[PDB]
């Protein structure tokens, strides 16, 4: 579409901007996939975590 052409003209008339764009995309996508996998991991198996044992503080 025209959005692809707009993005092309905005970002790629130089090269250092391209390098910065790649680095930023990497260090955003990393965080996004981390959040997604952590959330799915939490959802899959509820009740088994370390903060879910009912007797965690009764050996004083």
């Amino acid at each position: 579409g025209g959005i692809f052409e707009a993005l092309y003209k905005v970002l790629m008339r130089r090269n250092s901007v391209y390098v910065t764009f790649v680095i930023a995309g990497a260090f955003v996508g990393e965080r996004a996939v981390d959040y997604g996998v952590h959330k799915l991991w939490e959802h899959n198996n509820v009740g088994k975590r370390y903060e879910d044992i009912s007797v965690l503080g009764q050996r004083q």
Binding site: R14, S16, V17, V19, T20, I23, F27, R31
Partner: peptide
């Protein structure tokens, strides 16, 4: 010299951004 100076400015900016990210690596920035 001006296009070359600003090209060097942009390259220095890329390098400085990467080095700053090396110094502090904030997960949720």
């Amino acid at each position: 010299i001006q296009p070359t100076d600003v090209k060097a400015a942009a390259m220095w900016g890329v390098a400085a951004a990467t080095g700053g990210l090396y110094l502090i690596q904030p997960w949720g920035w």
